[PDB]
Amino acid sequence: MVLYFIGLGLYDERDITVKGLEIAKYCDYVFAEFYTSLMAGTTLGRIQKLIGKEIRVLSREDVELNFENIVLPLAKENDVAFLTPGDPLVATTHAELRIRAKRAGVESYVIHAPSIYSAVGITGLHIYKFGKSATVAYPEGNWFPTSYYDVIKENAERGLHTLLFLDIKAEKRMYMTANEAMELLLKVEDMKKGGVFTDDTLVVVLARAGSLNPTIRAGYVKDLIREDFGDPPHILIVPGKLHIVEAEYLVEIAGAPREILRVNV
Amino acid sequence: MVLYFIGLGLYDERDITVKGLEIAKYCDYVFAEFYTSLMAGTTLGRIQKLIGKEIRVLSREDVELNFENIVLPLAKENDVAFLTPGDPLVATTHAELRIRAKRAGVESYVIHAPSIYSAVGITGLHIYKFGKSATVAYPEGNWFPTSYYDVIKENAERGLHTLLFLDIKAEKRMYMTANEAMELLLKVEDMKKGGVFTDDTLVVVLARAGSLNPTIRAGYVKDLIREDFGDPPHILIVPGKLHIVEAEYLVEIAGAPREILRVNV
Numbered sequence: 001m002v003l004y005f006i007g008l009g010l011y012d013e014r015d016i017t018v019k020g021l022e023i024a025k026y027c028d029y030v031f032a033e034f035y036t037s038l039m040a041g042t043t044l045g046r047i048q049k050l051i052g053k054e055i056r057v058l059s060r061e062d063v064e065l066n067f068e069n070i071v072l073p074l075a076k077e078n079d080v081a082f083l084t085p086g087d088p089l090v091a092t093t094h095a096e097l098r099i100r101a102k103r104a105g106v107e108s109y110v111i112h113a114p115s116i117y118s119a120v121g122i123t124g125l126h127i128y129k130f131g132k133s134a135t136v137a138y139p140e141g142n143w144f145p146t147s148y149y150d151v152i153k154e155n156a157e158r159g160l161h162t163l164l165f166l167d168i169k170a171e172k173r174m175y176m177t178a179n180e181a182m183e184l185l186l187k188v189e190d191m192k193k194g195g196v197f198t199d200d201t202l203v204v205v206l207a208r209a210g211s212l213n214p215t216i217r218a219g220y221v222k223d224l225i226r227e228d229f230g231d232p233p234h235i236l237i238v239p240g241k242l243h244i245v246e247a248e249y250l251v252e253i254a255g256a257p258r259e260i261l262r263v264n265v
Numbered sequence: 266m267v268l269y270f271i272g273l274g275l276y277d278e279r280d281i282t283v284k285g286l287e288i289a290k291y292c293d294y295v296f297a298e299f300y301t302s303l304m305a306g307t308t309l310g311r312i313q314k315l316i317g318k319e320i321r322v323l324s325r326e327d328v329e330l331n332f333e334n335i336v337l338p339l340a341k342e343n344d345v346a347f348l349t350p351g352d353p354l355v356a357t358t359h360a361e362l363r364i365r366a367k368r369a370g371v372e373s374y375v376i377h378a379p380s381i382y383s384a385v386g387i388t389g390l391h392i393y394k395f396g397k398s399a400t401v402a403y404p405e406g407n408w409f410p411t412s413y414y415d416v417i418k419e420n421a422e423r424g425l426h427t428l429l430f431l432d433i434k435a436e437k438r439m440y441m442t443a444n445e446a447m448e449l450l451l452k453v454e455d456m457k458k459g460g461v462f463t464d465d466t467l468v469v470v471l472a473r474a475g476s477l478n479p480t481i482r483a484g485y486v487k488d489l490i491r492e493d494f495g496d497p498p499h500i501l502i503v504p505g506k507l508h509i510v511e512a513e514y515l516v517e518i519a520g521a522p523r524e525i526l527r528v529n530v
């Protein structure tokens with residue numbers, strides 16, 4: 001009688017922690033959601049094979065509206081696991097589900113897994129220098145989200161880097177690319193004209209983190225906006241002022257223009 | 266010809282990912298460093314037994330001064346693994362090691378694992394609201410560093426949370442407790458009087474993240490300063506203004522006082 005929130009990691013079924021896998025194997029029922037992020041290097045079948053259980057996938061509605069009706073009931077007489085991509089409580093609203101588990105008299109435990117939030121360390125940018133994060137959401141109807149632009153502005157003014165989660169429409173299988181994010185940002189710039197995001201802005205793209213060969217690229221928007229970064233998921237980063245060692249890594253590992261080595265102190 | 270940076274995760278020998286374990290077993294030689302952080306929930310012996318490999322531990326000097334003489338030579342003609350606590354490259358000095366590998370004509374790949382940076386999501390605080398991060402360092406001699414206090418001020422001022430890594434003397438295996446961190450912050454406050462950290466400041470303590478029984482506590486400094494949060498490692502967080510959902514999680518999961526539901530939202 002317990003509910004486990006277990007993260008599956010960044011890219012494939014092997015990104016789950018050993019602890020998570022062993023626990024998942026001891027569970028009676030296994031549920032999961034694959035709408036908060038995209039695991040581009042595996043399939044449900046492969047995940048099911050590793051765990052050795054039949055995984056029942058839930059939609060955003062099943063979870064947000066009926067988690068206490070689909071999962072919690074079974075957790076009262078069995079050990080149940082709820083699997084999610086990356087880390088279960090990062091950039092998701094799953095934390096609140098623990099409250100539902102409590103109010104249902106069910107004890108819950110959390111098993112972490114690699115998260116894109118920390119995986120960005122592979123870009124060479126100092127993790128402690130990342131400020132507030134934001135999500136670039138697809139505009140819909142007459143609604144055109146722009147809050148992420150102000151986040152970049154605020155962080156940049158403080159010399160902090162900005163991590164930009166990219167939008168996803170799992171049911172429509174739509175995964176926003178870094179290219180699309182840049183296009184949207186250039187549009188917001190023309191509107192607000194704050195000089196926050198332009199063709200000369202240095203950005204960093206990380207695609208398919210977790211894979212053995214993720215795409216890590218750094219350069220100016222004018223140069224990368226049309227570059228092919230490979231299959232999704234993608235994450236976009238707008239660095240603040242760089243430390244010399246950050247610039248060196250971007251040049252040596254992410255193929256950034258050598259001119260950025262010359263920092264303006 | 267290959268060097269694999271493999272994260273060991275948060276607390277014990279099972280926090281490594283399945284991918285990291287299989288690759289560690291696949292490698293011919295395995296090195297590891299325990300100076301950027303420690304794995305408090307296990308021992309070198311237990312890690313070795315899990316991997317089934319002899320593990321050569323490296324000191325900060327071994328790595329910072331002689332990485333290219335100790336690790337890379339073998340990586341040139343063999344598959345070599347370099348284990349680090351948490352997620353590789355979160356520690357600021359790890360990144361440049363990939364440049365050294367490049368210089369020596371050695372390929373390198375990163376296998377991620379959970380980091381405390383993302384693991385803080387278990388506190389119920391929204392990850393996007395975390396701003397710049399900082400480390401609380403023990404004062405010594407005539408040196409009293411206090412930049413971490415300023416980090417809190419700047420973050421809180423913008424309604425952002427502040428993750429505070431607590432000092433660790435890896436070699437001496439000594440951990441700064443949240444209690445000691447709170448006392449230091451109160452001292453800094455008494456010196457700067459910026460009204461950033463007082464007895465009425467709401468803080469969150471996360472101890473032994475990764476274990477199945479971490480200590481998650483939230484409350485005002487005046488009540489938590491002498492509380493026993495259990496064995497290390499301890500992490501201190503000074504949240505900024507809270508979203509009602511964050512506050513409710515702290516009350517329901519971290520035993521925070523109901524007062525935060527009206528004072529800190």
Ligand SMILES: Nc1ncnc2c1ncn2[C@@H]1O[C@H](CSCC[C@H](N)C(=O)O)[C@@H](O)[C@H]1O
Nearest residue numbers: 010037086087090115116166208209234235
């Ligand atoms: N492997 C990966 N590579 C690049 N971006 C990734 C990624 N995994 C997730 N993301 C990014 O983050 C978004 C999902 S947000 C949910 C994140 C998840 N809980 C975690 O811990 O990683 C995606 O739309 C994408 O922009």
